[PDB]
Design a protein around this ligand. Structure first.
Ligand SMILES: CCN1CCN(Cc2ccc(Nc3ncc(F)c(-c4cc(F)c5nc(C)n(C(C)C)c5c4)n3)nc2)CC1
Lengths: 274, 242
């Protein structure tokens, strides 16, 4: 017998299409639906579905689970991805007042990203909206429409990540790898204490300036060489809101300018703080 | 403006990453020989003909090296579970290249470009329709592990300097494409095609052959005798690809 989930709430809209909370009116069970908006299928849809299908073989607890992919059809075909429903994102989870939870939240966040990186996957769009939390407190990473398998010598999409969570090497239009997600993790780690974005830049150059105001200006041996804007274009700045000693140490290793010295997700899970 | 992916030491040096690929690869190996029970009209020589056509399109368009073997992976997995007629082979192969390219390339193949190489009776509508059909039959599971994905991991475990690998890599790529054209390799684990191609390439360029075979087998947990037989088959297929 067939059943149907009917949409009961819009939970997001993007150029990628629309995400819906949906409910079977006969069973009461919920899912989430993401609906895709010579030619052919959009590249982002093919990539997102392919990566989730590869990851579905592991059933990792800290990644959203893709349940189904329906393609129906009129001239225009509609693709619908079906996800197990999660009640909220990280923003909704926080404005509900503990530090003990943040360490467990951070532990799960790092476990999910380490599982991606250990699977050759770079997310390239980590942000509070894409970090979901079930009612039971389980972190679920979402939105893999910008993600890719990282393969040595492949061409890369030059501009990735939303502005406020974008790594300096990407802001400087340099090459990048798995550390880009770790920079976003640092921004998200600090945002759990600030409850406000750490770097609210107005542009790419303004984002780098706000970044350098806290991390300090890298000398010269750390400045990337494959960039056009040199180090002398930015003013000199020095380093140094209510977290622990060892937590601040872990944060600085995530927010390291040079991505090769930036801490990995695995090493962060081994940090004294967690 | 146009960045290229460098060698991430966090990935190449983390043993769990290689272990993850080794665990995933069997998931993407085509089930069984579809030539005896599932396909009737479609014969092995037709697959080899289609493969060379696909390889020529990928070469003439300068696709990334993974696109052609990945398209052949989709082709074999599709033919393992969908009876297909000879007159539809070209359309199927064109769509497999389109999907592989869309997945792996920043500047992918387009439906209009594929119409250059397909016969003129094939239209963009059919390509759009078959893209959806192939996605459905493959359950959209396109991020397959293919032999090329192991290349950088294996070379990282050779102490041959990065620059001296340039010709090894180029030559190994010839063997990787050859294996994808040849149905006798269609069911080998991608890690064995990769180590066999590397072994054939490093030997063809000239620390001995037995020690290298021992090392290549140890890297992937493969039996030494099995790797030796695969490398000899790869070498023989090249010399006889006529
Ligand atoms: C209008 C604002 N209010 C208050 C804030 N609230 C946030 C919120 C966001 C999501 C969920 N639930 C949920 N459960 C399972 C999933 F799989 C996804 C999911 C899957 C995907 F593929 C996605 N791709 C993208 C781009 N998104 C974004 C929408 C995050 C995806 C989300 N989402 N619950 C609450 C929305 C309603």
């Amino acid at each position: 017998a067939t059943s149907r989930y009917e949409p009961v709430a819009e939970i997001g809209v993007g150029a990628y299409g629309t995400v819906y909370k949906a409910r079977d009116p006969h069973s009461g069970h919920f899912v989430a639906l993401k609906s895709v908006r010579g030619g052919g299928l959009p590249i982002s849809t093919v990539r997102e579905v392919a990566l989730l299908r590869r990851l579905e073989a592991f059933e990792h607890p800290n990644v959203v689970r893709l349940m189904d992919v329906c393609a129906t059809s009129d001239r225009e075909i509609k693709v619908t991805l079906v996800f197990e429903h999660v009640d909220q994102d990280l923003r909704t989870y926080l404005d509900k007042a503990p530090a003990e939870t943040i360490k467990d939240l951070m532990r799960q966040f790092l476990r999910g990203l380490d599982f991606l990186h250990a699977n050759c996957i770079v997310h390239r769009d980590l942000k509070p909206e894409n970090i979901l939390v079930t009612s039971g407190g389980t972190v679920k990473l979402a939105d893999f429409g910008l993600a890719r398998i990282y393969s040595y010598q492949m061409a890369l999409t030059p501009v990735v990540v939303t502005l406020w969570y974008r790594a300096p090497e990407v802001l400087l239009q340099s090459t990048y790898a798995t550390p880009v997600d770790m920079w976003s993790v640092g921004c998200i780690f600090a945002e759990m204490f600030r409850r406000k974005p750490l770097f609210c830049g107005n542009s790419e150059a303004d984002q780098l300036g706000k970044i350098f105001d806290l991390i300090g200006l890298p000398p010269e041996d750390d400045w990337p060489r494959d960039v056009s804007l040199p180090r002398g274009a930015f003013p000199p700045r020095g380093p140094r809101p209510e977290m622990e000693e060892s937590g601040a140490q872990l944060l600085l290793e995530m927010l390291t300018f040079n991505p090769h010295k930036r801490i990995s997700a695995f090493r962060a899970l081994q940090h004294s703080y967690l | 403006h146009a960045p290229r992916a460098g060698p991430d030491p966090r990935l190449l040096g983390d043993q769990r990453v290689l272990q993850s690929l080794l665990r995933l690869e069997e998931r993407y190996v085509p089930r069984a020989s579809y030539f005896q029970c599932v396909q009737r009209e479609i014969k092995p020589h037709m697959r080899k003909m289609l493969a060379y056509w696909m390889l020529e399109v990928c070469e003439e368009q300068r696709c990334e090296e993974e696109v052609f073997p990945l398209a052949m992976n989709y082709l074999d997995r599709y033919l393992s579970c969908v009876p297909t007629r000879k007159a539809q082979l070209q359309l199927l192969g064109a769509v497999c290249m389109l999907l592989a390219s869309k997945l792996r390339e920043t500047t992918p193949l387009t439906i209009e470009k594929l119409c250059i190489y397909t016969d003129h009776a094939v239209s963009p509508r059919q390509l759009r329709d078959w893209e959806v059909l192939v996605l459905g039959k493959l359950k959209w599971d396109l991020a397959a592990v293919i032999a090329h994905d192991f290349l950088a991991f294996i070379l990282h475990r050779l102490s041959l300097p990065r620059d001296r690998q340039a010709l090894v890599k180029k030559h190994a790529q010839t063997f990787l494409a050859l294996c994808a054209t040849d149905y006798t390799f269609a069911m080998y684990p991608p890690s064995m095609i990769a180590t066999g191609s590397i072994g054939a390439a490093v030997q063809g360029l000239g620390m001995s052959g037995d020690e290298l075979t021992e090392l290549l087998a140890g890297i992937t947990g493969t039996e030494v005798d099995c790797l030796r037989a695969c490398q000899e088959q790869i070498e023989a297929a090249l010399r006889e690809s006529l």
